[PDB]
Amino acid sequence: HHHTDPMVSKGEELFTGVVPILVELDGDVNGHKFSVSGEGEGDATYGKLTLKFICTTGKLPVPWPTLVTTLVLCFSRYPDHMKQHDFFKSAMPEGYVQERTIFFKDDGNYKTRAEVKFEGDTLVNRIELKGIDFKEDGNILGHKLEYNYNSHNVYIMADKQKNGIKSNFKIRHNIEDGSVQLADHYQQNTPIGDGPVLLPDNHYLSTQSKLSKDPNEKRDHMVLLEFVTAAGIT
C-alpha cells in the first residue's frame, strides 16, 4: 500500500486484494492422458490460497498429492522488509514461466512447463506435464500415497544470467505403510516480458498445505488450502 520503491509498488498493487485463480493442466503419464481444472482465490496479504481441482477426464491416474507443487508462488506473503526480493510479483502482469523436473526416487519423473500470467483480472496457471518411466506397481501408479501433505521450506536463489530464479528441493510424500516417497524437485523461473524484474537475494519460502474433500462432489477432485511465507532475511 505504501513503498518507497515504485517498482515494488507496481507489483504489490496487482495483489492487494483477493485475486481469482484458474489452473489448467494437460498431462500424460506413461501414456495415461488426463486434464485437471482448478478454480479458487489467492490473498497474498496473508500468503493464502484456496483452490478446488477437478479431473475433467475421469479418474486421475496419479495421486493428487504428487501434483500439489505443480498445480502459484506469486501469492506468497513477503514481509515488508523483503518486498524488494519478490521476483514472482515483479514479473506480472506479463508473467513468468515455471519449469520443473521432478524425480520420484526409484520411480519415474515429471517434466512440467507452466505459464503464470494475468488474463484480465484472473491469474491463470497453464501447465503441461509429461511423466515417463513410472513403475506400474510403484507408489505413484499404484496409488499408495496418503492423502496429506507435509510442511516444507524451500530455498530460492537468483539466476542472474537468465534474469530469473532457481530452486532445488525435496518433497517427502507419506506412503500408506508409514514409509516415505521422496520427490526431488529442480525448478527454474524466467520472465515472459522483457521489462526489468526484481532479482532476489537468497531467501526461503515456508509452506504449509492442507488437503481435503468436498463431501457433495462426485468427480475426482482435491480441495487445497495453502499458506506460503517468505523468510530468512533479518
Curated annotation (Swiss-Prot):
Expression sites (tissue/organ): Photocytes.
Alphabetical UniProt keywords: Chromophore, Luminescence, Photoprotein
Keyword hit for Transmembrane: no
Use in biotechnology or industry: Green fluorescent protein has been engineered to produce a vast number of variously colored mutants, fusion proteins, and biosensors. Further generation of mutants led to more stable proteins (at 37 degrees Celsius for example) with brighter fluorescence and longer fluorescence lifetimes.
Impact after mutating residue 166 to Q: In R10-3; matures to the red-emitting state with excitation and emission maxima at 555 and 585 nm, respectively
Effect on the protein of changing residue 152 to D: In Cerulean; leads to improved quantum yield, a higher extinction coefficient and is 2.5-fold brighter than ECFP
Cystine connections: none
Outcome following mutation: residue 207 to I: Suppresses the 475 nm excitation peak, leaving only the shorter wavelength peak at 399 nm. In H9; increases fluorescence at 395 nm excitation
Post-translational modification: Contains a chromophore consisting of modified amino acid residues. Maturation of the chromophore requires nothing other than molecular oxygen.
Mutation effect (residue 76 to A): Increases fluorescence at warmer temperatures such as 37 degrees Celsius. In GFPmut 3; highly fluorescent mutant when excited at 488 nm
Mutagenesis / variant outcome for changing residue 37 to R: In mut1.28; shifts fluorescence lifetime from 3.03 to 2.76 ns. In mut2.2; shifts fluorescence lifetime from 3.03 to 1.94 ns. In mut3.3; shifts fluorescence lifetime from 3.03 to 1.88 ns
Phenotype for residue 46 to N: In EBFP1.2; shifts the excitation and emission spectra to shorter wavelengths and increases quantum yields compared to BFP
Consequence of changing residue 151 to P: Increases fluorescence at warmer temperatures such as 37 degrees Celsius
Effect of residue 154 to I: In Azurite; shifts the excitation and emission spectra to shorter wavelengths and increases quantum yields compared to BFP
Subunit structure of this chain's protein: Monomer.
Function: Energy-transfer acceptor. Its role is to transduce the blue chemiluminescence of the protein aequorin into green fluorescent light by energy transfer. Fluoresces in vivo upon receiving energy from the Ca(2+)-activated photoprotein aequorin.
Name under which the protein is recorded: Green fluorescent protein
Lineage of the species this protein comes from: Eukaryota, Metazoa, Cnidaria, Hydrozoa, Hydroidolina
